[PDB]
Write a protein that binds this ligand. Structure first.
Ligand SMILES: Nc1ncnc2c1ncn2[C@@H]1O[C@H](CO)[C@H](O)[C@H]1O
Ligand SMILES: Nc1ncnc2c1ncn2[C@@H]1O[C@H](CO)[C@H](O)[C@H]1O
Lengths: 246, 242
């Protein structure tokens, strides 16, 4: 009875799945997230349905922001919740680290300068987006390469908002970034300020060194990037300043 | 150190999965990493805890064809790494958008090729799950996203974080039934998989398990699936309903 044709199974995790579909009335591309309840223990945490409704709430707080997927529809069949979101076209930032990173040992500085400009675009777009989210009273809590969409026109977007929370809440909980240890004792907009600094270095470091080097090496990492990329040098300095503020 | 990360595959609950190559032997490997306190869940488990648990399950299942081997595991500071063998092939869920939508006024030869293919894949999933139970552990996340179809059409399973000993839930297509335990949890998932291989995606998500017999009827009208196959699935899925 649905007006949506589900055409692809993208992901499933913890009672929640993500599918690509089609509005049959308009042909419009959509994304479907759905959740099923789990009667369980408190130690089990929030179930898929509870986390689905929080994400919908957060996306409704952020409606109208360019870079935040719109909520098109929501319904329940029995206790099966469905959340219909607009589909952000483009590629996630983590898929650029496959090819666009091996900037080989000795490459053409034409491509080096082009990449530095490109990376600074992406961080600036992600920062503007994060700023607009803070203006609604929301702190994204999960900023990293796997959540950042790079659209065909080079503008950016963020995919998963299940981890976002109101800014007024004061929570010592810090989610870790793929590259550096979670910073001890941070809340409010400072959590995103930290992830953005991590992203400023990650955009230039090769994947292997990303996972291996810890946050005490940030100063070394900034100086190393400066010698190999034409970055305005205080830009990298300020990232290492933010990552090592404790 | 002895690995070169080539691609960033996924990051969830403070844990990253990366594709890599052993710099010595040149072999393809999968890198999983976790930092302490990261991904702290309501039950006190962090990403290191889950990674330690996944290695334990993989070690108890060593030697089973279809369970990725544990190649390496080490720490770099407080940073834990788990190096697994790369399963070649495609995840079963990527076929559900490519192989079986065109089989809507369809070509009967292709309908038959797909049917024999799906019964082979499901039978291989059955044997893998049987060998795993024999080793005393129950898979818990058996569904199309966890099954790899290798080049030779043999199957493997991919994520063993959810695995647990038989001593001590929801499926993409249907709700988990109340109070099933032991190896019976895995056989419910296998039953759901039987109908899932033959249903269109929208009917999978929309139809609940009260309609199992109806969906089994619908499947036999499009596919040459033996009826006992579909009825064992419908019966197992409804075994505790009015
Ligand atoms: N609202 C949305 N628009 C486009 N893609 C979405 C999406 N929500 C999830 N995805 C897809 O999930 C994967 C990353 O979690 C994929 O990287 C990502 O494509
Ligand atoms: N040993 C392995 N061989 C191939 N792919 C692996 C893998 N381990 C994990 N993946 C891929 O990572 C994602 C989530 O773990 C995907 O679920 C999964 O495709």
């Amino acid at each position: 009875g649905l007006p949506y044709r589900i055409e692809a199974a993208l992901h499933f995790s913890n009672g929640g799945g993500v599918y690509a579909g089609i509005d049959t009335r308009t042909g419009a591309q959509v994304v479907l997230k759905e959740a099923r309840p789990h009667a369980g223990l408190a130690a089990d945490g929030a179930d898929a349905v509870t986390r689905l409704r929080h994400e919908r709430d957060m996306l409704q707080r952020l409606a109208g922001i360019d870079g935040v997927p719109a909520v098109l529809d929501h319904f329940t069949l029995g206790e099966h919740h469905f959340l219909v979101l607009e589909r952000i076209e483009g590629r996630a930032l983590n898929t650029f680290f496959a090819e666009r990173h091996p900037l080989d040992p000795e490459p053409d500085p034409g491509k080096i300068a082009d990449y530095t400009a490109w990376a600074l675009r992406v961080h600036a777009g992600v920062e503007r987006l994060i700023d607009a989210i803070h203006a609604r009273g929301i702190v994204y809590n999960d900023l990293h390469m796997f959540n950042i969409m790079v659209r065909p026109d080079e503008t950016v977007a963020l995919i998963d908002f299940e981890a976002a929370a109101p800014l007024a809440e004061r929570s010592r909980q810090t989610l870790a970034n793929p590259a550096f240890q979670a910073p001890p004792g941070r809340y409010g907009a400072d959590v995103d300020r930290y992830s953005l600094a991590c992203l400023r270095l990650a955009l230039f470091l090769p994947l292997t060194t990303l996972l291996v080097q810890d946050r005490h090496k940030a100063w070394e990492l900034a100086e190393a990037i400066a010698e190999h990329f034409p970055v305005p040098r205080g830009f990298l300095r300020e990232a290492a300043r933010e990552i090592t503020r404790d």
